[PDB]
Symmetry: C3
Subunit: 336 residues, 3 copies
Amino acid sequence: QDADKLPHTKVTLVAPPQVHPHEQATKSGPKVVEFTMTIEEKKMVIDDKGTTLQAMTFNGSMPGPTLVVHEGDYVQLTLVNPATNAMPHNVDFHGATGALGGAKLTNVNPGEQATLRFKADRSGTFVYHCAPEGMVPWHVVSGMSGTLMVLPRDGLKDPQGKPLHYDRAYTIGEFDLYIPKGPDGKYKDYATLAESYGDTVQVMRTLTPSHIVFNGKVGALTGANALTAKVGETVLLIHSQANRDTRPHLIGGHGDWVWETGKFANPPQRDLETWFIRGGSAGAALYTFKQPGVYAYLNHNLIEAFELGAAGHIKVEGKWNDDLMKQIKAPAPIPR
Amino acid sequence: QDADKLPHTKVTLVAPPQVHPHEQATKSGPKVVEFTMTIEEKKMVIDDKGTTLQAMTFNGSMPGPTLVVHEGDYVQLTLVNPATNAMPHNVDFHGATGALGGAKLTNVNPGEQATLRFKADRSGTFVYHCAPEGMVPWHVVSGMSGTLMVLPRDGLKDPQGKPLHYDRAYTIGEFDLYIPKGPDGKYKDYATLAESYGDTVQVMRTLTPSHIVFNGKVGALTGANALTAKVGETVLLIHSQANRDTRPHLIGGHGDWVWETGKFANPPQRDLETWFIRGGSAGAALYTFKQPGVYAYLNHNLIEAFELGAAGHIKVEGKWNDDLMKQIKAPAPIPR
Amino acid sequence: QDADKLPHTKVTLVAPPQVHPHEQATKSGPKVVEFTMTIEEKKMVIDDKGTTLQAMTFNGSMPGPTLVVHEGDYVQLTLVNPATNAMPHNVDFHGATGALGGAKLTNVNPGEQATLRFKADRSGTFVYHCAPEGMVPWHVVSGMSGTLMVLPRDGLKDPQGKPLHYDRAYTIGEFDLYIPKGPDGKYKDYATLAESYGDTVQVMRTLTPSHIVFNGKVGALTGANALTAKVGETVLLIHSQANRDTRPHLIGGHGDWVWETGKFANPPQRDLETWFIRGGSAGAALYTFKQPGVYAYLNHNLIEAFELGAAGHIKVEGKWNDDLMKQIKAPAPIPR
Ligand SMILES: [Cu+2]
Ligand SMILES: [Cu+2]
Ligand SMILES: [Cu+2]
Ligand SMILES: [Cu+2]
Ligand SMILES: [Cu+2]
Ligand SMILES: [Cu+2]
Ligand SMILES: [Zn+2]
Ligand SMILES: [Zn+2]
Ligand SMILES: [Zn+2]
């Protein structure tokens, strides 16, 4: 026990899909790691036809940034709700024990801020999300979630206890969105956040999302914004879904080691084609690239991916390996 | 073999969320454990606006009571269908081998009763449900399911083979309900069970539940009816869903050890934030409370929980632990 | 490396639910295994009321046939798209590494054919499916998927490393179908494949299937077409779902050993009542029959099974075992 004896570090958060610099295995000791996050309500364009979402976010982004600590650290968050916002908010860390994830101790009306500490005594990727009483699903589906990664002190491990590592970490929040439609069957635009509410609840209750998006927008992780890697590189793909199940898949790739339930004291599974993230959870997959090219990373309900938007790209540099894959005969007429 | 050489015990069932008294590890030997259950059709109020369900139940409750035996025992059930009921019924134990779970050997018109025996040769929590030919989903979604827990003879075990135990067992049946609506868009009330049928089937086919409820009602496990524990206590949370997937989560807590597929010869997983119960199955989680307070136990599709009703509370007594969690700065104005 | 040094074998594919002859454990060495498949677009009757699907298939069947190799082999597929078809097509093997599963190297307009080779370096059942740019979900949901099983060289293994085997392999593709309805609320019939498109997309986007079917049709694996086994026999049930989650269950039976994620380097789970196939994946269960009779194999969302069609039968010959299950008292009046 006593956390007050311990050294402090301040961490500067970065925007998804990146994750702030951290060590995997560490020789360092339990610290009190300090973070600050600032809630921002805002309208966002979520697709290529100018449909908007009256959104709510931690730190301006969907998802919130990923916070990283080691098992044994103490997370200390200053949560700030500017008076420029319209709603109260709080925070529920699934990584934390007591007070409803910290939601009870972090209720912040606009103009307020609070500071929570909890011990990160359990390794894994864990969702955090806003949970204001009477209003939980709305705040979550409107964008208010992210990931806390608690790495084992000696870093990641395979089922045999052998070390595993990644060279690059990426963070993907998947967001099932419930955008209301007018009598004309066009999506509704709302002047304020409060005004989106009633109509939104009614779409939510149909359990049918209008949109399902990575990192805030259809196409968010495509084009200039595609993720990147090199043949030989190991990536950790962190995938959070605070409200609905999803099934990540890397087209042309695999999940070399996957913790689908996101909890690193458990052995991961290997060679996965498609894994499963349970709504209300974050999972983690390692992949070491072996072929160059553009890969698709997606929800493998293909409707949810291609029709609804749950899909991104990874652009991978390096040398083609004909042993792994070879075009023997290119497309050509069927021999007469 | 031969079951006829064996001693008999009669078990007196109790109503959910409690589970009848049983031993975990036992020095005792294979018995023929005798149970009796009586089907009851009845109208139930399922939410706080007086919406009713033309329900069908084992022993008067949703879910049915939980039956407990040890691996190697023989379950012997007398299933009674009173002439005061309108439908035939039977029973399908997923814990059992042959005759479609026992459904073929237990077809009981109103006024009849039958007695089934099967060997409980496989450990785990297992769903049982009514499965009358031509009418299976209807009977299941209208309430006719429950759990058979078959404990290992030497009790529960962690992945390393170390003993695990619970001090208190709770049983939660989650029920996706398909209540029809009138042209006025109000829920339909039906004078008889038979009359609910056609309209219900049509809602079912949309795969969109009107309600999703723990133990028969919205708010069933809240207020006076909240579950209870103490700091230091280990609870086993048994969660059945005979028809639809769900994703249990304990807010402010974890799944210390979880058998999401519900089968105790498999190693459980640890530190889970959210687990997954496959429709047609029962799972089991252990949690040892470390902080006092009211916890929410819920389906972490938050729409299904807060809008539709898949949520309950656990009221936990004891001493707050500031090491685990501490309000450093309560909500207060953002410093100018 | 070099695949060109290696011997070739030609495999003759068979129609589901059968799987072409293969060895489990093998003393043989890495070969280049050659397959050819021919795409066929066609109208199919999918239920007992003459509803049709403008379908697209590999080799004339839903699902495609199952291709079997051993870990270390090279799969070499000649994919043929006859000029009698209307669409371009390709193939994405989840078992393969690079070029989007091989989709990029296999784009075949009608009248063309291509040949792909990749190394099957990872054991498991893996989905393959057509993935033509701009048109992926449509081709997949209209029938274009199947399984590649890559067996370990020394065959299947339990979590302790002990050998496992099957005597009979069956392959089940489950297909969520999105059949449009007219203003009269009857299913739409389409003269051409291209004409089904726009309406189909709109049903897809509701994420509500009109039909969910094993192997192309409601009742496909029932009656004369039921699967078969004997008491004492071990079956491997391969279950693919290229687009949507499903939850296989064997009524009256179990999953003795189950790889729900379908990847044989992972330990399987035992005693499962219901397992979970993630959309975009194939899983595998072993079961050794202990009782004769007709079993139901189904998606245990019972609505999806009985209302929508995700259910088949297994007819099992042999001797009843009263130790496992016994009708103690048949149905008879409740004693006065
Ligand atoms: Cu909020
Ligand atoms: Cu939560
Ligand atoms: Cu019944
Ligand atoms: Cu069942
Ligand atoms: Cu195609
Ligand atoms: Cu795919
Ligand atoms: Zn590396
Ligand atoms: Zn205890
Ligand atoms: Zn055998």
